[PDB]
């Protein structure tokens, strides 16, 4: 069964916009914007543990990703936890500075095959 699509409650002001709150929202979009890191963390976590996309970690990651996608329409920050960060990256990424670990999943097999083909 698919995940629920129930979004966050809308935030309605008691007065009209004074052209300053829109600027505050625009500036605040730069901070607490974890849209790009949630997908990478989910991919890394799915690569690491077996029976991927079945544990509660993947469900929480999907919920956070949906909330972050909905952040553009409703002002609800994603609030990415610190303990959910990957801290490890597979071989098929451009994060050379970050620690790189050998991946043994289907993506790792594809990367090994393409490396053997190009070499």
């Amino acid at each position: 069964p698919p995940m629920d699509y129930a979004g966050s409650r809308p935030r309605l002001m008691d007065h009209d916009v004074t052209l300053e709150e829109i600027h505050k929202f625009f500036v605040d979009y730069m901070i607490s914007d974890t849209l790009g890191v949630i997908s990478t963390a989910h991919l890394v976590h799915a690569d690491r543990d077996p029976e991927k996309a079945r544990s509660q970690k993947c469900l929480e990651l999907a919920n956070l990703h949906s909330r972050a996608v909905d952040f553009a329409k409703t002002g609800a920050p994603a609030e990415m936890p610190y303990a959910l960060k990957p801290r490890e990256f597979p071989d098929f990424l451009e994060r050379f500075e970050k620690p790189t670990y050998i991946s043994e999943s289907v993506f790792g097999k594809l990367y090994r095959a393409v490396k053997s083909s190009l070499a």
Binding site: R9, R11, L12, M13, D14, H15
Partner: peptide, 9 residues
């Protein structure tokens, strides 16, 4: 209530 929002959060 929030600083300027209307309703209960």
């Amino acid at each position: 209530t929030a600083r300027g929002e209307e309703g209960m959060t």
